[PDB]
Design a protein around this nucleic acid. Structure first.
Lengths: 171, 102, 64
RNA sequence: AAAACUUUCAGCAACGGAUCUCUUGGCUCUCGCAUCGAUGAAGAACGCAGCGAAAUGCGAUACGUAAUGUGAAUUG
RNA sequence: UGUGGAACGGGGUAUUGUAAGCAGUAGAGUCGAUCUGCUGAGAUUAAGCCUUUGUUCCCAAGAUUUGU
RNA sequence: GAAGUCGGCAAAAUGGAUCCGUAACUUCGGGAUAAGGAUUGGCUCUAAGGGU
RNA sequence: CAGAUCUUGGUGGAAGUAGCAAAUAUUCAAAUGAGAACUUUGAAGACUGAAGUGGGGAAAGGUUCCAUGUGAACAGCAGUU
RNA sequence: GUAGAGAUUCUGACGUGCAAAUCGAUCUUCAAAUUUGGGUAUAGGGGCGAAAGACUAAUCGAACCAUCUAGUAGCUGGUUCC
RNA sequence: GUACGUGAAAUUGCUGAAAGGGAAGCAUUGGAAAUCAGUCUUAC
């Protein structure tokens, strides 16, 4: 399957894919938006910090009801969380992308996360039982994730021509 | 690095106001946090006898002070785990100072 | 790992409850190998499985 | 007041299964035929294959026997 | 790397009501409720009390963002 | 100490046992645990109540 | 076809929101394992307290029994169970 | 007064519930007109009813199923290109 | 690539661009920015 972005030219990049991963699509999107653009090594440091509650993933789009924290101030936001299931999946994919770059012969010092995207996977669905003999949906929202790591990043009129000549050349 | 010390912990102050049904689990957590702060090791193993002594008077009544023996042991399987082993010490009165065990 | 089958067999062989069944926690590998009632009897003979004594219900205060 | 966010547009990628093409099916018309059962029918139940649950087929001769025809397969 | 921080210990303050142990020419009685002495003792005391020439331990670090 | 509230709604109070005491009324059976009072631990003792 | 609280199917905002708060309660070590608040063993703390959260049967179920094995899916967290 | 059978009050909890009738407290009864298992009988303009139009499979001032039936419509709604 | 022909819309993520002081959409006129065709070049 082909990726979303014009990069993934295999001469100077690596990429890694994940499909039908059973973790929340909204949390995955927030993690992807946070890590998009930072270097691969520093991305790993950030992800371990999130796992250890030393840094937090800012919640920008899917922020309804998300509590405030002091660890969102380095992103200029008030709402941030520590989604460990999503971060664990992103950590596994980033390790896979780093392995792909290793086998491909790239440079680990200069690699950055050039592209990362989360898409909604088909919902698996379940049932929940309500009051008054009612049943409704207990849907699950999985995610497709794809990551790409890479390196680095007049004519002039006759009067105008005569004016230009007589001013510049003549003096 | 590897060092063994006896401490007295003021569990009375750390359990003041704690819900009766979490007193003993809170005491174990306060032991772990007490060991982590003193020996600077995140890995703390509590001796089952120490757990027995904490839970001696039930889930609601924990002794006001405990005499603990903290040992910053290197490791068994890992190379540089550097964990704290915490056990209980039977003394007449826990109201006594910190000592360094040979 | 799992020793639930061994405990049910031990309780039946020792003629007591699973609450009264004790397995040597330092012999898990050999106890797990024991999978039949012959094997459980051999464990009980070797002392690796023990029927624990009843809890204390003294009638001293009642008699006094 | 830059970012975020929201909305719009486009590209790519998702979700979804519309559309187009197809069709051992259905529907309607016409033509022809007349043949169930106590000599056990229609229907039901349980079984039957080297490896089968269903469908299809069969009845302890059990995915069939005999006889006739074809002529060298069956096939995972 | 300081009249530094912490964990304890000591002192003060406060709450309760004289702890456990041992001893008695105390105890109705036929061993024994209880009482007395040591004993305003003992226990508790910052968990949002005060104070400490005390004891032991810890600290000269990582990350992140910022230019007139 | 019912001032609350449409209303003592909710809550409180009472409560076991022993002894004393117990009204109107009545279909004489009840009412009745009416209502009202007192007593209750521990310990050392005796006093009776049975069998051969 | 834009309508019929139209039909069928699909998908949104609400929204990572309401919520996952009855039945006293768990804790330590070890084992297994990629992974352990939840699996197993030991230790401790508890409860049901014989009109039981015990041991059985009838009605009903039908293989849920038992051992072994385990990528999912299901057990509204998790899961090696 | 317990088990058991009930269901007075809080007009409490809950009220997209644990529950299409449950939970808590309080309360009524508790040796008989008692409680109840299985077997059996009574079927829809019928049954059964210590009688509430109660109950008769969450359906009752006439159960449920399928047909007559695409019942009827002076009534509401919709009725597709320039 | 069996989650399998084609693969629409709703709706979604990414990227680029743009806009925004309690709605948005639209119409009209021009600016700005991006984009683009005609015409021409010739014929006599």
């Amino acid at each position: 399957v082909r990726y979303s972005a014009s990069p993934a030219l295999e001469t100077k990049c690596a990429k890694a894919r994940g499909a039908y991963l059973r973790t929340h699509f909204k949390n995955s999107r927030e993690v992807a938006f946070t890590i998009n653009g930072m270097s691969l090594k520093k991305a790993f440091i950030f992800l371990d910090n999130v796992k250890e509650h030393k840094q937090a993933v800012p919640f920008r789009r899917f922020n309804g009801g998300v509590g405030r924290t002091a660890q969102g101030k380095e992103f200029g936001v008030t709402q941030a969380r520590w989604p460990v299931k999503s971060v664990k999946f992103f950590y596994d994919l980033l390790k896979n992308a780093e392995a792909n770059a290793e086998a491909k012969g790239l440079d680990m010092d200069k690699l950055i996360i050039k592209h990362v995207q989360v898409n909604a996977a088909p919902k698996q669905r379940r049932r929940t039982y309500r009051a008054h003999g009612r049943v409704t949906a207990y849907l699950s929202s999985p995610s497709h994730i794809e990551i790409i790591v890479a390196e680095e990043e007049s004519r002039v009129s006759l009067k105008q021509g005569a004016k230009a000549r007589n001013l510049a050349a003549r003096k | 690095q590897v060092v063994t010390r006896d401490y007295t912990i003021h569990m009375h102050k750390r359990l003041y106001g704690v819900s009766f049904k979490k007193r003993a689990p809170r005491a174990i957590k306060e032991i772990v946090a007490f060991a982590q702060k003193h020996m600077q090791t995140k890995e703390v193993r509590v001796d089952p006898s120490l757990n027995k002594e904490v839970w001696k008077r039930g889930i609601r009544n924990v002794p006001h002070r405990l005499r603990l023996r903290l040992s910053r042991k290197r490791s068994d399987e890992d190379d540089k785990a550097l964990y704290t082993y915490v056990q209980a010490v039977d003394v007449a009165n826990p109201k006594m100072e910190t000592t360094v065990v040979e | 790992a799992n020793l639930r089958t061994q405990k049910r067999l031990a309780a039946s062989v020792l003629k007591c409850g699973k609450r009264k069944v004790w397995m040597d926690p330092n012999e898990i590998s050999e106890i797990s190998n024991a999978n039949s009632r012959q094997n459980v009897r051999k464990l009980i003979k070797d002392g690796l499985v023990i029927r624990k004594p009843n809890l204390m219900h003294s009638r001293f205060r009642i008699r006094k």
